[PDB]
Amino acid sequence: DKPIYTLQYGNVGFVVNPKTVNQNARLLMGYEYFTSRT
Amino acid sequence: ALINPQFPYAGPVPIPGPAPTETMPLLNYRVEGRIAGIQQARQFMPFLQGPHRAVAEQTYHAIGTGIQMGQTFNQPLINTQEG
């Protein structure tokens, strides 16, 4: 209902504060979005 | 509607009806409503009112300096053709 859109309210970020981090840890991010074709 | 003679539809719901209640009354509401908490002039946001740059142009400053100095080598003299 209110898509994340920088330029509407500064840079935005997705945050994760981990309690435990093993070797080779990583976040796989998946996005669903609409965009502009200039 | 169809009415059929001789069995006619009663000419009304008549006087044998059972008045079941006198609960018909909606008591008018009387009330005083006050929403008066101190208001402070400000709200905090991450950003309001900015029209952020999607790309900037390239930008620069400028300088020059020096003097006019030179080491030169010239073509030799030649016989003049005509004139």
UniProtKB/Swiss-Prot annotation, chain A:
Top-level division of the source organism's lineage: Viruses
Annotated localization: Virion
Subunit structure: Homotrimer.
Role according to the record: Major capsid protein self-assembles to form an icosahedral capsid with a pseudo T=25 symmetry, about 66 nm in diameter, and consisting of 240 capsid proteins trimers. The capsid encapsulates an inner membrane and the genomic dsDNA genome. The major coat protein P3 and two assembly factors (P10 and P17) are needed during the assembly of the virus particle inside the host cell, when the capsid protein multimers are capable of enclosing the host-derived membrane, containing the virus-encoded membrane-associated proteins.
Protein name as catalogued: Major capsid protein P3
Residues of the full protein shown: 347 to 384 of 395
From Swiss-Prot, chain B:
Name under which the protein is recorded: Minor capsid protein P30
A Pfam family reported for this protein in Swiss-Prot or TrEMBL: Tecti-min-caps
Compartment(s) where it occurs, according to its Swiss-Prot or TrEMBL record: Virion
Gene this protein is translated from: XXX
Subunit structure as annotated in this protein's UniProt entry: Dimer.
Its biological purpose: Minor capsid protein essential for stable capsid assembly of complete particles.
Cellular component per GO, a single term: viral capsid
Superkingdom as given in the UniProt entry: Viruses
InterPro entries noted in UniProt: Tecti-min-caps
Keywords, in A-Z order: Capsid protein, Virion
GO-annotated biological processes: viral capsid assembly
